């Protein structure tokens, strides 16, 4: 088998309101997804509360 | 149809105690309102508590 263990990093570049990450595959093969992270620049100008 | 998805930003300029935002329309057409935000300068001189 070709199975492997995480993680896997991949660029999701752009605004948060517009990027829709999704996982289609197919297959004759399993998968497991444990967690999901993200990073990114955050800048709110109006310092709230 | 002409439906669309948010957001929509629009100036509510002035003091908070005096601005009354409200939504009349009419129509033969639906609407949905999910959330509402606002920003604005806040300056309380007397640093309370």
From Swiss-Prot, chains A, B:
<comment type="subunit">
    <text>Interacts with head-to-tail connector protein gp8, the tail component gp11, and the fiber protein gp17.</text>
</comment>
<comment type="function">
    <text>Structural component of the short non-contractile tail. The tail complex is involved in viral genome delivery. Forms the end of the tail, including the canonical tube, the nozzle, and the small extensions below the fibers. Once the tail tubular structure is formed, the interface between gp11 and gp12 generates the proper environment to interact with the six gp17 trimers.</text>
</comment>
<protein>
    <recommendedName>
        <fullName>Tail tubular protein gp12</fullName>
    </recommendedName>
</protein>
